[PDB]
Write an enzyme that holds these catalytic residues in place. Sequence first.
Site, PDB file in Angstrom:
ATOM      1  N   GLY F 144      16.797 -37.551  -9.232  1.00 23.84           N
ATOM      2  CA  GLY F 144      17.799 -38.541  -8.839  1.00 23.84           C
ATOM      3  C   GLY F 144      17.350 -39.356  -7.626  1.00 23.84           C
ATOM      4  N   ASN F 206      10.282 -23.736  -3.318  1.00 31.33           N
ATOM      5  CA  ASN F 206      11.435 -22.959  -2.876  1.00 31.33           C
ATOM      6  C   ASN F 206      11.270 -21.479  -3.191  1.00 31.33           C
ATOM      7  OD1 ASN F 206      13.255 -25.111  -1.833  1.00 31.33           O
ATOM      8  ND2 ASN F 206      13.156 -25.837  -3.953  1.00 31.33           N
ATOM      9  N   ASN F 228      14.840 -24.556   5.113  1.00 32.18           N
ATOM     10  CA  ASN F 228      14.680 -25.792   5.865  1.00 32.18           C
ATOM     11  C   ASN F 228      14.265 -25.523   7.304  1.00 32.18           C
ATOM     12  OD1 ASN F 228      15.554 -27.012   3.505  1.00 32.18           O
ATOM     13  ND2 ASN F 228      17.669 -27.220   4.223  1.00 32.18           N
ATOM     14  N   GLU F 254      -6.339 -38.408  12.394  1.00 34.26           N
ATOM     15  CA  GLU F 254      -7.442 -37.488  12.646  1.00 34.26           C
ATOM     16  C   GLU F 254      -7.521 -36.409  11.572  1.00 34.26           C
ATOM     17  OE1 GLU F 254      -7.610 -36.460  16.705  1.00 34.26           O
ATOM     18  OE2 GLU F 254      -9.414 -35.223  16.544  1.00 34.26           O
TER      19      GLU F 254
HETATM   20  N1  LIG Z   1      14.297 -26.183   0.624  1.00 32.06           N
HETATM   21  C1  LIG Z   1      15.428 -26.802   0.303  1.00 32.06           C
HETATM   22  N2  LIG Z   1      15.551 -27.429  -0.918  1.00 32.06           N
HETATM   23  C2  LIG Z   1      16.700 -28.061  -1.248  1.00 32.06           C
HETATM   24  C3  LIG Z   1      17.765 -28.084  -0.363  1.00 32.06           C
HETATM   25  N3  LIG Z   1      18.771 -28.772  -0.944  1.00 32.06           N
HETATM   26  C4  LIG Z   1      18.366 -29.186  -2.166  1.00 32.06           C
HETATM   27  N4  LIG Z   1      17.087 -28.744  -2.372  1.00 32.06           N
HETATM   28  C5  LIG Z   1      16.255 -28.985  -3.561  1.00 32.06           C
HETATM   29  O1  LIG Z   1      16.757 -30.097  -4.276  1.00 32.06           O
HETATM   30  C6  LIG Z   1      16.735 -29.850  -5.663  1.00 32.06           C
HETATM   31  C7  LIG Z   1      17.920 -30.530  -6.337  1.00 32.06           C
HETATM   32  O2  LIG Z   1      17.813 -31.935  -6.262  1.00 32.06           O
HETATM   33  P1  LIG Z   1      18.492 -32.757  -5.057  1.00 32.06           P
HETATM   34  O3  LIG Z   1      17.560 -32.886  -3.879  1.00 32.06           O
HETATM   35  O4  LIG Z   1      19.779 -32.085  -4.657  1.00 32.06           O
HETATM   36  O5  LIG Z   1      18.817 -34.200  -5.687  1.00 32.06           O
HETATM   37  P2  LIG Z   1      19.101 -35.439  -4.706  1.00 32.06           P
HETATM   38  O6  LIG Z   1      17.829 -35.833  -4.000  1.00 32.06           O
HETATM   39  O7  LIG Z   1      20.172 -35.072  -3.713  1.00 32.06           O
HETATM   40  O8  LIG Z   1      19.616 -36.633  -5.651  1.00 32.06           O
HETATM   41  P3  LIG Z   1      20.851 -36.404  -6.654  1.00 32.06           P
HETATM   42  O9  LIG Z   1      20.332 -35.866  -7.960  1.00 32.06           O
HETATM   43  O10 LIG Z   1      21.561 -37.708  -6.916  1.00 32.06           O
HETATM   44  O11 LIG Z   1      21.809 -35.414  -6.041  1.00 32.06           O
HETATM   45  C8  LIG Z   1      16.799 -28.342  -5.816  1.00 32.06           C
HETATM   46  O12 LIG Z   1      15.954 -27.917  -6.858  1.00 32.06           O
HETATM   47  C9  LIG Z   1      16.313 -27.790  -4.494  1.00 32.06           C
HETATM   48  O13 LIG Z   1      15.029 -27.237  -4.647  1.00 32.06           O
HETATM   49  C10 LIG Z   1      17.649 -27.452   0.866  1.00 32.06           C
HETATM   50  O14 LIG Z   1      18.586 -27.462   1.660  1.00 32.06           O
HETATM   51  N5  LIG Z   1      16.477 -26.812   1.195  1.00 32.06           N
END
Ligand SMILES: Nc1nc2c(ncn2[C@@H]2O[C@H](COP(=O)(O)OP(=O)(O)OP(=O)(O)O)[C@@H](O)[C@H]2O)c(=O)[nH]1
Lengths: 431, 431, 49, 54, 437, 437, 50
Positions: F144, F206, F228, F254
């Site tokens: 997305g 993750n 995070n 660098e």
């Molecule tokens: N490490 C980490 N990964 C996250 C976190 N929140 C979401 N993700 C990753 O994001 C993925 C889901 O996609 P999103 O990043 O939520 O999608 P988006 O960029 O918000 O865009 P949309 O689909 O419109 O919601 C998951 O598979 C997670 O691995 C977080 O707080 N920490």
Amino acid sequence: MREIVHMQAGQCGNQIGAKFWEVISDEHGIDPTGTYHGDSDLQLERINVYYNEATGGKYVPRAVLVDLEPGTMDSVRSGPFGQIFRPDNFVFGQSGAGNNWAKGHYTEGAELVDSVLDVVRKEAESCDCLQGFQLTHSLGGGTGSGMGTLLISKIREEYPDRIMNTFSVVPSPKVSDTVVEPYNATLSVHQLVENTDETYCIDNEALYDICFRTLKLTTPTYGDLNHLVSATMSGVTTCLRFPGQLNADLRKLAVNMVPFPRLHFFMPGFAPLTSRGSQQYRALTVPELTQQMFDAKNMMAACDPRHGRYLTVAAIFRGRMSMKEVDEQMLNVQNKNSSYFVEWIPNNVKTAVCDIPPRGLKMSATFIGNSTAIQELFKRISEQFTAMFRRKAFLHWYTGEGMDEMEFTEAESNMNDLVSEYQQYQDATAE
Amino acid sequence: MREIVHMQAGQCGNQIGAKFWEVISDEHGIDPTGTYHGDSDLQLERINVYYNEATGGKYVPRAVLVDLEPGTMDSVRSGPFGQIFRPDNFVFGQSGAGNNWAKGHYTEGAELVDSVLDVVRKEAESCDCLQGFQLTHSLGGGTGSGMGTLLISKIREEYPDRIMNTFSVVPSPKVSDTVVEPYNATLSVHQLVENTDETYCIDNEALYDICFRTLKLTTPTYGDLNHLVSATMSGVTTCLRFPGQLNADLRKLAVNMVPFPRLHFFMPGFAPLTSRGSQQYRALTVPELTQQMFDAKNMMAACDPRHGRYLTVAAIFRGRMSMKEVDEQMLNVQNKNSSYFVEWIPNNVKTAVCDIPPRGLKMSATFIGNSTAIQELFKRISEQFTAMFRRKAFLHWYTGEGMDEMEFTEAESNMNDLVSEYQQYQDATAE
Amino acid sequence: SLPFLPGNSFNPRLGRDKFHKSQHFDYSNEVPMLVGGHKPGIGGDKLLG
Amino acid sequence: TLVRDDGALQLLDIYVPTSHHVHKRFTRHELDDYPKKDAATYWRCEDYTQAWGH
Amino acid sequence: MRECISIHVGQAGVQIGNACWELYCLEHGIQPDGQMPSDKTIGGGDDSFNTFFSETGAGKHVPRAVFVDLEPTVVDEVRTGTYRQLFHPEQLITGKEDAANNYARGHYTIGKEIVDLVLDRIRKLADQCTGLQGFLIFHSFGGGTGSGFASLLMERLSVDYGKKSKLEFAIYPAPQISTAVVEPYNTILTTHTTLEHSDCAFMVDNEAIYDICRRNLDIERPTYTNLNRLIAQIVSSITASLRFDGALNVDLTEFQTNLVPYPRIHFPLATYAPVISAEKAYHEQLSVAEITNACFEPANQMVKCDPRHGKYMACCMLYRGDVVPKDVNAAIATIKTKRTIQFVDWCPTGFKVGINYQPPTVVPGGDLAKVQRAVCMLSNTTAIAEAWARLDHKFDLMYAKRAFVHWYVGEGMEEGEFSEAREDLAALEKDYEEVGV
Amino acid sequence: MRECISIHVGQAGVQIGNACWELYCLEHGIQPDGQMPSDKTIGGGDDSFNTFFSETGAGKHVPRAVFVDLEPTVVDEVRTGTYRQLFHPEQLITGKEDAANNYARGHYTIGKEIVDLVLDRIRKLADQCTGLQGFLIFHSFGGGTGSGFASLLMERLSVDYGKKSKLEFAIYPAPQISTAVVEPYNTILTTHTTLEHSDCAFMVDNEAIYDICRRNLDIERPTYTNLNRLIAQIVSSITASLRFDGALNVDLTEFQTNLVPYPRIHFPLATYAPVISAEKAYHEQLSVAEITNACFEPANQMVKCDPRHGKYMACCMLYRGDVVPKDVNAAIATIKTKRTIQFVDWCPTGFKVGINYQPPTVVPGGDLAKVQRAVCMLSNTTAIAEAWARLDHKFDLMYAKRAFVHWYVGEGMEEGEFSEAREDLAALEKDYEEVGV
Amino acid sequence: LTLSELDELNNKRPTLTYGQAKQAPPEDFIPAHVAFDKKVLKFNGFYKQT
Ligand SMILES: Nc1nc2c(ncn2[C@@H]2O[C@H](COP(=O)(O)OP(=O)(O)OP(=O)(O)O)[C@@H](O)[C@H]2O)c(=O)[nH]1
Ligand SMILES: Nc1nc2c(ncn2[C@@H]2O[C@H](COP(=O)(O)OP(=O)(O)OP(=O)(O)O)[C@@H](O)[C@H]2O)c(=O)[nH]1
Ligand SMILES: Nc1nc2c(ncn2[C@@H]2O[C@H](COP(=O)(O)OP(=O)(O)O)[C@@H](O)[C@H]2O)c(=O)[nH]1
Ligand SMILES: Nc1nc2c(ncn2[C@@H]2O[C@H](COP(=O)(O)OP(=O)(O)O)[C@@H](O)[C@H]2O)c(=O)[nH]1
Ligand SMILES: [Mg+2]
Ligand SMILES: [Mg+2]
């Protein structure tokens, strides 16, 4: 401010909505007078998803109430939480077709479609972005089924970019509760397939089984059934109203479900549903929520998921839960039950999580399963339809008002094509 | 210090002014005894617009009540807020008009004309500015029409500069309520066109529609139907008698609304019109005010304003509101429905906002439309007049008082001239 | 069972013997209207508004 | 009205999100105990230059 | 010694002047009754107020404004409001009947019955004046009082005070947003006679301030109070050089001699920077380069006119606050290298700046924030020709059918004056085209 | 003045920003309201903040970040949280509808509505700075906005800013753990912008961070907060060589020069590895050799692919704290003489050692122990092709019978885009395997 | 439930702890040109001359 406009059609939809607007009013701290006696700012921050400002800090539902006879809406108004609805959304006729899909679609129900379209346009005009349309009805009457599908067709014509989703209580394998429900269901599914974005088919037999087997509930009535359905609605729409670690709107559910556009009939589920005297024996943890969510005898439809393959599974969680445990359980159920999962889709389980559970519960979880087992329901309805149609039982009530055999044959052909499509995607291999 | 004298003529004019002088007395906080029991000095500041300060502190309306028979004037003096009027402005005739325009123009009303001109001359002499003359009357009566047109002709002769506005209950599309209504209306609109600066046509059928389909009321009677005219008469001159962000008195309204001297027939509108069971369910905002004004139901003189084109629309808002939404709603209406506005006049809307709403609402609005849809009303009156005049029915009752059918074929021809002028200014291209 | 929850809502009609309705909605002549606002609820109990 | 201070009964609140719960306004005590950025190093105990933050 | 009196004519002029005089009283520390507090000091010399307030022997600062309107409403609201003991009673002078959106009514019938009294009040102000640098005239191009009476006052003041400058703060109608229907007639008849008797006319549109309040101030539903406060900030930034000393001081004649190339083009744009709110003012550096770049943005113009469609003649920059006359040169050097900002080929140096040390004064209960520095941009662009062209389009569209002409002609006005205004404004079209090419 | 702009796209970007600007403020002494007392600053710091925060001249330290998310949930949670007054309101940008795990809805519709606004905010943050080193972009490949909108945004930064270095901290889908179904499609479709619009493309997994949290920090139930926080520790250890003193401190370009051998090969692994709980840190030396061997231990990587099946090409060590180079050289010698660590033949010397005189800061309530020595190792290995191939097979299993493709087709994105992205993925995989052999 | 375990949670009661844990109040930051805006100290002098 993404937001849903709600519609109830028929007496089943009206009694379902009359408790849905109780459960989300209790979620958002709305007393029956209409004010906000809440407990936190994270109860009003996204209260515009379902409510509109009226005056004096009072919130009205964004709901449209539809019937062809004010029989159940009198009970809705007379019951509790019935004075919150604006008394201009009560759209009614003077006719009462009841259990005739033709009379709810082509004749007398079809002169009310202009007025209900006018009030739906008026409700949608007070919307900045208008995330979705939702409809509660039943495929067993003529006002819930026929007028409901007419509403779906008109709304899909006016707004061909919107999440139009329906819940609908589908006819039961046992009893009938209506003689002509094969005709009603095979004429309503033909309209549900081409128009709705997704349909969360609910079965009263599965609800009764959930009430006795999982909730004991010696005298359930229809209140507990409508409560289970409404809890499923609230769990579906939770991430649209409350913050979470992984948000999921209805469009995100539609993307992480239906892969081929005419397969959008889902078997919903809820967890936890602990028995009346088993709370000191149950353990409220994420693995137990996952087990009760994926238990075959816990769905709110009478289609066995072990007789088919899960196309996709959406698990929507609520509470303070660890993402490693949640994703581990989501992977683990597929790894341990890989037979009930399509191999050509890796990771069939979409996972969503929200931070705000329902009041009184630490954790909750809702199941939304797109499986190749709702073809059993469509096969049941198709067989019950062709048994009547090969002898022309009750067909005069349709041909007299103006139907012809061509509509019945087209509906049967499309529904059997849907059955064949589900069977094909069940039998499809990886390569 | 701008100020207007008021005249009520005939039974309908007296019964409408009876509640006009009650609604505006409630606005100014004047007790039924005649004293001031208000709470704001904005009421007492511009109170000489309509009231003269008598000795002792009582405020007397600057109104002359004219009827050829004393029953209706006894009724208005017996009504609530009817003892505030000075009995020196209660001129009566011994005989009765009999719903005959000649009996009220060329006979018995032509001997009470000296007394009404003496009273109006005294009231207009006791002035400093004399903005203009209001006449409340109905077409379709003897002294409502004939005596009213005689009054307007004489006052136009004495003061051919002051603003003359008549409020003209014009006869009905369906039903009759009087058999000689096309005769009276045809004989009266000649003098109205020749003399009056502006005329606000009003239909009882459109009033019934807005009290029934919009305002519910079950039985709407004449009290509510006259309150809905008193609201318009108050909202026309609210900018004259109250401070505002943008002021607009009668001459501003006339200059902005009429493009040509003969196109001065307006249909009114008042638009916080909500059902009593739906006041607490509606967000009373400027966009919803705009939507209720620009609705074909809300007009008070039939004439569905989609068969013609808006030459000019005046919108007088009363309330603490935002000029940005005022002008953007007036612009959005024109941009969305530019086909229903004339193309040779840009921005066919004159706006005003006057801070102080009427007592009991947070905001209100008044609609004044100079559409080309009144060709339907004038054509209908012409058709009924021609139907009754080709066979010369009820003509002896008018020719026995001195008139001849030269005057009838004169008045019908001038009505047809008005219709042709409105047709021409409707279907005229910019090039 | 103070929070609302699925299954934590018992039968409120137990012991009641009068379940009389009331016609809140009725066409006046051709317009649909809410003719209620003074009619009671199920069994004649008083409403809120 | 009580300020969040990581209480056992405040862990039972279901209306504060996990982001607000974990990313919180740290107090004087919470920044003057062990997250205080004092840390003995060779490069500080031998008095090297204090440019750029040391 | 450098006092310059003001005449607020029309309802728009009266309300704008009320906001302006509230701002001036807050700037010079004068309480609403007209007295210094005498228990706290706003800080200043002895002649900072002696350009808008005339000191009396007792210690009351009566202002130097004439609030005139032919309608008894807005001036009486001023007379009743909180600034009732400030203005002299013979300054809040008022006619008896409104001019009714009619230029002929305001110029020929009702205006002549009170123009003698307004000249008498202006003369009695100018007699106790000693160093008159001009007349400020605050009005809108709406009609009647702001059009006809303002026009008549322009001719009478040009006859009486010959070489004295007459600045206009004029509100121009928006391209689409307007209130009255006879506004094209009123505007063209106002331009016909202000083009011959005004030295400079700052045009401040309404829709542009609506856009500014929506986007910058985060108020998507404003009223006239915020608009009048922003216009008050504009005029205060213009006239602050006559009150507070600075690095570069621009006199009222210096504006005209360094802003007006030819005596037909005296219609500069208006721009304020930063129009910022207290929720987001303290998170920005608000430096001289930032506030200078914010002036040339098309969305930040206080008139609905896109400067990218035309060519700049001359820009008058007025910096107030913590401004050193080095960052101004740096910002001008960065702007003059841009190819989008196009200047005319006959004006190599097209900038006149005035640096002033006094920061702009925040109004309590207002919308703007207390900023370290701000800048007012007044530019002569050939892009302003499109407003005149669309006004020609509206005037042609109505005058083809002779709509609303009877109201003007029936009360002391020949029919040829409309065509005179039309041909002067077409000549002005040709003048902008000739000075642009 | 070695400024870097942090752009956080998507919910995964925004939550990393919440866990990262908390660490930045607590490291540089910035209060959540925006002031430095004196105490919480690094000794001799004074201006050491001036690569993440900017003075307003009055004391306010506004961070140099743009939080973007089409969904208005998590960004308003930022606007409601404890760093409410820290951020400028324009730095936190929302749409109305999210892209709903759809690259088409992130790149062609919906997301093509605020990309210019985000670019304008980035341009304001860029010309506020004087020595801009580059842009650090935080997003996920879950789908997305983190894929489509981040693709569009990083594309337009690549064509606009040019010479500025665009680091990517991308979140990658796991071999088995996945929170969505269309992640293979959304991850295949965005490889072009990580391949040709990024200068370095650090990736985290993750599931790998889950395994690290479970083994090392003794958290049997970790979450996105801890994930995070570890990512923020990695980025802080990367950027501290721009902030504080050190012996061989690196400056973005660098270690790009010392890391990428070829323009197509810019996908290294990032391992911060004194990662341990306090109870377990009580029983170890945590010396230089230990924290160097922990980086090359193939169970402390943040991508689930052990490098024992591949060859190292360039390792950049970023050491923090009391780390004398005499121990770092011995650790590098031990790593070189290790059996299982195999370097590629055309890289004789392959260690870019950098040392910073600043031990890591610890967040209260955090899960990491307060060590005095730190290593962030960025290693270019031929083992990320394992993750590329896992993604490739999970994509091919779906594209064989065209699941979920109608969602992408009905919102732009013609059918050949899937094949083109698959083809360039195969080209990158071929490049890595032929480098490895 | 025993009388032991019913003695608390009539005192603890997690249903009545909903929304009770509120945020710390944020102390505001104002620049010194706004805090000391329009604040002038007046003194009266002597200034003798010959
Ligand atoms: N490490 C980490 N990964 C996250 C976190 N929140 C979401 N993700 C990753 O994001 C993925 C889901 O996609 P999103 O990043 O939520 O999608 P988006 O960029 O918000 O865009 P949309 O689909 O419109 O919601 C998951 O598979 C997670 O691995 C977080 O707080 N920490
Ligand atoms: N900015 C601003 N503009 C105003 C205000 N009041 C009126 N206007 C402008 O004035 C125009 C209407 O004409 P007016 O200036 O009010 O006419 P008038 O001054 O009242 O003179 P008459 O029409 O004879 O009564 C509108 O288009 C507004 O743009 C105000 O308070 N602030
Ligand atoms: N779960 C549930 N099902 C209901 C309820 N009311 C009716 N139904 C179902 O609806 C079916 C009858 O359809 P009906 O609602 O009468 O169609 P209508 O005439 O258009 O309103 C029956 O099979 C019932 O099982 C209710 O309150 N809850
Ligand atoms: N709005 C309104 N109209 C009325 C009322 N009473 C009568 N009318 C109308 O007035 C008309 C009769 O005119 P009338 O006043 O009797 O004229 P007159 O006989 O010369 O006095 C009828 O067609 C009615 O529709 C009233 O109370 N309100
Ligand atoms: Mg006026
Ligand atoms: Mg999201």
